[PDB]
Amino acid sequence: GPLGSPEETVVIALYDYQTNDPQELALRRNEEYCLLDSSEIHWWRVQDRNGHEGYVPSSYLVEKSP
């Protein structure tokens, strides 16, 4: 891993989110997600701990800043 990502921020899922289409991803209560794109609560691009990235609601995600 010589290079990194534009967004080294993480977010925590507040509630189990569920999408209707494959375009977006689902969230899981008490879980972290590697934030990639955060333009607005409308859609937040994050990545799971498996290697997949998708869109999710920011309203159900908290900025992991301990």
Strand content: 35-45%
Helix/strand/pairing category: mainly beta
Sheet with most strands: strand arrangement: 4-3-2-1-5
Instruction: Outline the biggest β-sheet.
Output: 5 strands, antiparallel
**CA-based gyration radius:** 11 Å
As for the number of domains, it is 1
**CATH architectural label:** Roll
Helical content class: under 10%
CATH class: Mainly Beta
State the distance separating the first and last CA atoms: 25 Å
CATH topology title: SH3 type barrels
CATH superfamily: SH3 Domains
Total DSSP E strands: 5
Task: Give the overall shape.
Answer: globular
Reading the helices and strands in chain order gives EEEEE
Q: State the helix count.
A: 0
Modified residues (Phosphotyrosine): 15
Organism: Homo sapiens (Human)
Family: Belongs to the protein kinase superfamily. Tyr protein kinase family. TEC subfamily.
Protein name: Tyrosine-protein kinase ITK/TSK
Explain this structure:
The protein is 0% helix and 38% strand. By secondary structure, it is mainly β. It has one domain (1-66): Roll (SH3 type barrels), CATH 2.30.30. The chain has a 5-stranded antiparallel beta sheet, with no helix packed on it. The chain is globular and about 35 Å long. Belongs to the protein kinase superfamily. Tyr protein kinase family. TEC subfamily. It is found in: Cytoplasm; Nucleus.
